[PDB]
Amino acid sequence: DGVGSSSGNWHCDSTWLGDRVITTSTRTWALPTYNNHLYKQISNGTSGGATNDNTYFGYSTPWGYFDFNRFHCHFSPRDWQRLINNNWGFRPKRLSFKLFNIQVKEVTQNEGTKTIANNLTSTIQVFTDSEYQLPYVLGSAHQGCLPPFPADVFMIPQYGYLTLNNGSQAVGRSSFYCLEYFPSQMLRTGNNFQFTYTFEDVPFHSSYAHSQSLDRLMNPLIDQYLYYLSRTQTTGGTANTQTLGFSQGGPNTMANQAKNWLPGPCYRQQRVSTTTGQNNNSNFAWTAGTKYHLNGRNSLANPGIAMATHKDDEERFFPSNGILIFGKQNAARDNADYSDVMLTSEEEIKTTNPVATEEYGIVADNLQQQNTAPQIGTVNSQGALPGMVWQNRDVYLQGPIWAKIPHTDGNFHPSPLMGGFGLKHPPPQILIKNTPVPADPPTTFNQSKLNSFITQYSTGQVSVEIEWELQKENSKRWNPEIQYTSNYYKSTSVDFAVNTEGVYSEPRPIGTRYLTRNL
Amino acid sequence: AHSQSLDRLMNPLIDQYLYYLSRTQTTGGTANTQTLGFSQGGPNTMANQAKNWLPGPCYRQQRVSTTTGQNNNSNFAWTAGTKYHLNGRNSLANPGIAMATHKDDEERFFPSNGILIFGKQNAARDNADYSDVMLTSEEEIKTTNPVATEEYGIVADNLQQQNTAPQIGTVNSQGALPGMVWQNRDVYLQGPIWAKIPHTDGNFHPSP
Amino acid sequence: DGVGSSSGNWHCDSTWLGDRVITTSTRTWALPTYNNHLYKQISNGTSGGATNDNTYFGYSTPWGYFDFNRFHCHFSPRDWQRLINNNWGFRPKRLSFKLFNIQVKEVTQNEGTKTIANNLTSTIQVFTDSEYQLPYVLGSAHQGCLPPFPADVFMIPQYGYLTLNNGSQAVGRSSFYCLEYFPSQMLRTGNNFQFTYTFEDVPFHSSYAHSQSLDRLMNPLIDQYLYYLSRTQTTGGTANTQTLGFSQGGPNTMANQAKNWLPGPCYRQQRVSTTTGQNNNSNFAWTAGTKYHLNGRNSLANPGIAMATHKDDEERFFPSNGILIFGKQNAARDNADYSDVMLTSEEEIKTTNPVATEEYGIVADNLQQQNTAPQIGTVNSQGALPGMVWQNRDVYLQGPIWAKIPHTDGNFHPSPLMGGFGLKHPPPQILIKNTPVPADPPTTFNQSKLNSFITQYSTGQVSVEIEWELQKENSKRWNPEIQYTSNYYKSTSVDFAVNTEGVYSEPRPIGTRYLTRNL
Known part of the structure; x- marks a missing residue:
């Protein structure tokens, strides 16, 4: 471990092993x-x-x-394709992290002329919050991750x-954390x-789409043995009075048939079209936004529970704040x-989950009688109901992977709403800092803390290796499946490649x- | 007691990489027409940021102040009381599900029948x-649970169009929702310790 | 041990082990x-x-x-709280000290443009006065300790x-010490x-307050079998002549009851109020100050022996120089x-010790007779008396810990008056210095000692680990105890945390x- 010896190598690769896939990337x-x-x-x-x-x-x-x-910190575009076109699911198993080839430099600034040189004896400090004692900042979709390229x-x-606040003030329970109160490792160039x-253990992510819908699980050729109320009034002309008629659900009355399950929970969002002309002319992004009320302040339920983005033939519609939105390369902030x-x-997921911009269903609203017509109510908010089944939000090549499950007395379906794996003990936070190097102190003692330091920054490489477990596909579907494919015809540049300027860009979310898989 | 609130778990110094609908109409003067503008949640827009969880379930109770002068002048203890309907007869949901007793700076407020009340030595029956x-x-628990005397949140109520303004509905009753996290009611030196869980086919969060 | 290798890690933490608590801090x-x-x-x-x-x-x-x-060089605020709210006492057992990641730099000064660079071959020197041969400067509440934050x-x-002096002159016995006459370790970057x-062995510090007072240890329901002189003169009207009447101390005459002990020693201080208007209008800080006379020169008995700061309902009163006073962050010198x-x-300690601003008691002053009325004297200075019991001054989160007991033929109750543990062989002094590096000497020999040196300073980290032994509480008190707690309502900032400027501050003395504990 010296000044003239590399303390690590560039490990960046992917290897497929049937039911595992190991990713490695260095930056x-x-x-x-x-x-x-x-x-x-x-x-x-x-x-x-x-x-x-x-x-x-x-x-x-x-x-x-x-x-x-x-x-995309781990999977290259092609790798992500290998993953999604051939497996019904996947999930993380273990990981290795490494810091090395550390170089701490100091910059001197005199009369506009700048000069950067090595400071061989300086140190950086590193430590992992392995006991989850610091506020877990990861898992909030922040920038600053390892680059895709x-x-x-x-x-x-x-x-x-x-921490807790009341307006701009702190309260009794507000906590203050000092990271220097944690044991941390100190490294000089040559240390790693x-x-x-x-x-x-976490559930595999559903890398599949259902090829059957919850309301169409029966046999299209056979009647049920069960009946349902099909008629409340006679029909023969004008002398129409009440009666009671019952029928058996069948191929043509599938919407009436008795069933065993219900669609997933619902928290309705306002609909907006990508064809601006079809939208109301007013700024309603926040006013009509779907939110939650927590101790006096409101937040957007963004993206909120998982619901189908739009129904059949409506690709131009989306929930005001109910989907993930990525920017294209260089999109304004x-x-x-x-x-x-x-x-x-x-x-x-239109297949099992309610459509985000529509009601959950209809419930009775009064007690009908001979002198009172039956009334109905529209359900726009529906919590868990015995018999519900649902799918979770999909994950994306450039989307988040995990999130720490809040330490609370209880929770329901711990799946991170932005997508990914919910973990009680997720990958620990890795904190790094450049050790302060004092500039020459005064010649006669002074109680005050030093505030004059040598200017400096550090640089080095970092490696992350993750082993993923795959869940192979076992379908008896006869016809081909839908697959992610590269465009076929000519184009100005290659998708998921660099510019003539050297800028890498992700053209679409994947x-x-x-x-597909049955229900 | 939690020293962080569910809606404040992010890093106060970094923007998100995710966007949200921030503008539905132009601004430049009077020729204001619809448009679509997107922004990235950040330190000053924490209420807009994308998040992973939701506050606990809610069954709203009527609010009453310990300063009698601030209360309506009528006997509403039972009439305005929060209850449940079981086979023809009603009972008070007392104290009911766990919810914060009041929000910031409101110590004088409490749910009509949503807290435990002990008598002082020799208080009348x-x-x-x-x-x-x-x-x-x-x-x-204001930190993870909804405040007992206020709504859970807001949901859409219709389908807005160019000729129809968007409408919203106030949620006063909210059952379990995927992603919710909550705390249970505290126990007290002079409070109960346990309770037998009813022998039934099913139940949710068996905490007395 | 090289230039490119860290020679130590950042150890800063605290771990509680039932009856021990180990503190670690690096700066x-x-x-x-x-x-x-x-x-x-x-x-x-x-x-x-x-x-x-x-x-x-x-x-x-x-x-x-x-x-x-x-x-506060060892305990974080929260840790100090854990300590004081749950233990009847504590004391130091052993410690580890470490110097590492040493960097010696040299600064060049040419035409206003300054530049600081490493001097890889320079050394610093370190040694411990393990035989207590140098004047023990620690233990005088000086600045320069490791920072709290x-x-x-x-x-x-x-x-x-x-050393000894007569005016501005030295005397025969005056001693001169040269620290280079001690073996010392020399380290270059990469050495530690x-x-x-x-x-x-030292006594546990009393982290408790008495819940009984020395003058109230008896049974409130029973009389004594002992008597006391209760009457010296008849009462029946005007023909009042001398007599002798004796009574038995009881519940209503507790101040007369025979007792087994006496309050602690006393050296009265002048009282001053925090309500300036109640104070005499004159500058008496020194003139009315309580002092001791030693070989022609006077010193303040500051804070002097341990005495209660004020009696019941008098929080605004304090001894002119009989308490410890800390400054708030950035208070003028x-x-x-x-x-x-x-x-x-x-x-x-009002409970066992005399109040600092009042007399110890009353003694006879003459021999009364039929022609001479009895006279009394007020005792303002009272040395040790058989039967006395007392408490020592409390210690504080930002107060001193130990002090070396003077090597003398005798002493009484060796507890450092500023607070803490008195030790005959305390933690040794750790002396450090930058080895002198000559600038180019003259080209032809010259007897004179060099006086031209390269300009330089050093920097590195330091670690101190101390193991403390706890004395758990064993009370049968039924009602809750008084505890140190953080404020409950909102506030501009958090107590014992940093500014918007990054300045750490200790809001109050703890x-x-x-x-509590019985007598």
């Missing part, structure tokens, strides 16, 4: 000095134009953190967290860091145009549900 | 005065 | 060159406005020193000492230093305002006496 990173080596209290009150729904109290730290919670050099995100993790983003579709 | 009983508070 | 430090590599004789005479009470003769050295004699980088204090120490400091209170 080069850069870590600056954050907050001037200081922990700062950050807050956002109700003053100015700031709304209550956006208040917060927390702290920003001098630490950075590693994040690879995005599928292996050649791209990336910057490490700064770590910060939130690494650890292993094993994923807890604010008010990007429709042609600059990529909307995803959960249309594959789902997971291509193979 | 009937019509004991407020100063003779001791009300408990489940304020520690 | 980053900076050490400049002190005194230009010279030992200088320093002195302060009677000339100018200098008073005799402040004369001194000593030396300032080129060495620095490590100090972690302050509880783990992220704060600190400067190492310069070492200097004092470390040692172990074991605390001698001189004439800081009352609202800028934090006064401590030893009110928890004592140790919350749980």
Whole structure:
């Protein structure tokens, strides 16, 4: 372990083993000095134009953190294709992480002329929150993950967290965490860091789409032996009075047939069309937005529970805040145009889940009598009901992978709403920081803490290896299946490749549900 | 007690990579027509950010203040009481599912029949005065559970079009929803310890 | 052990083991060159406005020193809370010290443009005064200890000492010490230093407050069998002559009852109120100050023996110089305002110790006779008396921990008056210095000592681990106890956390006496 010896190699590859697939990827990173080596209290009150729904109290730290919670950090486009076109499911099993070839440099600034040189004796610090004692910031779809393209050099995100707040103030229970109060490993160039993790048991992700719908599971050729109320009034002319007539559900009355199950839960969202002319002329993104009310402040149920994006022949419709939306390469941060983003579709689950922009169903609303006509109510919000079955939101090549399940007394169907695997003990947070290097101190003692440091940043490589377990397809379907394919005809450039400028870009979101399976 | 709230689990310093519908209409003056604008949730738009979970179930109760002057002048203890209907007869859902007793800065508010109430030494059996009983508070769970005297949230109510403005509905009753997380009612030095779970074919979250 | 290899890791943590609690903390430090590599004789005479009470003769050295004699160098606020809310006592058992990741840098100064670079071959020197041969400077509440906040980088204090003096002159017995006359370890980047120490047996610190007072230990329901003189003169009208009447102490005459013990020693201090309007209008801080007379010069008995800060319902009163006073974050060095400091209170010992601003008691002053009325004297100074029992001053989260017991023929109740554990062989002094690096010498020999050195300072991390033994609480008290708690309602910031500026601050002093115990 010395100055002139590499402390690691570039491991980037994928190997398929029948029922396992192991992914490996390495990237080069850069870590600056954050907050001037200081922990700062950050807050956002109700003053100015700031709304209550956006208040917060927390702290920003001098630490950075590693994040690879995005599928394209591990699967190359072609690999993702191999995965989705041939398996009914998959899930993470274990992982290896490694930091190496660390170089800490110091930059000197004199009269506009800048010079960067090595500081051989400096150290960076690294540690894993293996006991989940720090606020788990991963799993909130933040930027800063390893880049999709292996050649791209990336910057490490700064770590910060939130605690209880009342307006812009803290409260009694507000907590303050100091990352220097954790044992951490110190490395100089020539030292390396690494650890292993094993994923807890989690269900395979459904990489398939149903080829049968919940309301069409019966035999199209046979009647039921069960009856249903089919007539409440006579028909023969004008002397129509009440009666009671019963019939047997059959091939032509499938909507009347007795069934064993119900569609999944529902929390209706407002519908919006990609053909702007069909939309109401008003700014309703927030006002008509579907939300949840938590201790005085509202949040968008984004994307909320899993529901089909639109029904048959309506591809132009989507829930105002009920789908995942990725930006195209270089799309603006604010008010990007429709042609600059990529909307995803959960249309594959129309089969078992309610359509997001429509009601769940109809219930009675009163007690009909001879002098009172029966009345009905439209259900737009429906919680779990005995007999329901549903599918979870799909995952995407550029989507999140896991999320920590909140430590609470209870929960229902722990599947992260943004998509992925819910884990009680997920991959630990990996925190990294550049150790402070004081510039020459004063010549006579002074109690004050030093605030004059040598300017410096670090850089090195990082490797992440993940073993995935596959669930092979076992279909007796006779006809070909739908598959993800590259375009056939000519084009200006290659999809999922680089520019003439060297910029890598992901042209579309790639789902997971291509193979089909019965109910 | 939780020291973080369900709606504040993200990093206060980083934007999300996900977008959300942020604009439905142009802004530049008076020629305002529909459009579609998308933005990325960030530190100042935490209420818009995409999240992974939902607050616990809700069965709204009527609110009452310990400052009698702020209450309606009528005897509504039973009439406005939150109840359940079982084979022709009604019972108070007392104290009912676990919900925060009141929100921030409202200590004077409590659910009509949604908290445990102990009597002080020698408090009368009937019509004991407020100063003779001791009300408990489940304020520690505002963090994950809905506030007992307020709605669960808002859902769409119709299908908006160019000739129809979007309408919304207030949810006052919300059953289990995939993604919910919640806390159970606290126990007290002078409170009950256990209870037998009814022998039935099924049940949900068997906590007394 | 090389240039490119870390020589230590960041160990900062606390682990509770039932009856032990182990604290670990690491900090980053900076050490400049002190005194230009010279030992200088320093002195302060009677000339100018200098008073005799402040004369001194000593030396300032080129060495620095490590100090972690302050509880907050080891316990985090929350940890201190765990300690004080659940134990009747605690004390230090052993410790580990470590110096590592040393970097010696040299700074070049040419035409205003400064540049700092590594000097790989330079060395720092370290050694422990394990035989207590140097004047023990620790234990005098000096600044320069490891910071409370783990992220704060600190400067190492310069070492200097004092010896006998007569005015500004030295005397025959005055001693001169040279630290280079001690074997010391020399380290280059890549080398580390470390040692172990074991605390001698010391009594647990009383982390409890008495729930009974010395004058109320009897049974409130039973009379004594003993009598006392209750009457010296008849009562029946006007013909009142002497007599002798005796009574039995009982529930209503508890102040007369015969008892077995006496309150602790007393050295009365002048009282001052935090309500300035109630104070005499004159500057009496020193003139009315409580002092001791030692060889011609006076010193404040600060804080002096342990006495209750004030009696019942008098929280606004305190001894002029009889309590520990900490400053709030950023309080001025001189004439800081009352609202800028934090006064401590030893009110928890009113129970066994005399109140600091009042007399000890009353004694006879003459021999009464039929022609002479009895006279009494007020005792304001009371030394040890057979039967006395007392409590020692409490310790604080930001207070000192130990102090070396003076090597003398005798002593009484060796407990350091500022608070803490008195040790005959305390943690040794750890001295550190940057080895002098000559700049190019002249080309032809010259007897004179070199006085031209390369400019340089060093920096690295330091770790201190201390094992504390706990004395669990064993109370049969039925009702809840008083506990240290965080505030409940909203606030601008969190107590014992950082600013929006990144400045850590300790909002109040935190004592140790919350749980209670009988007498």
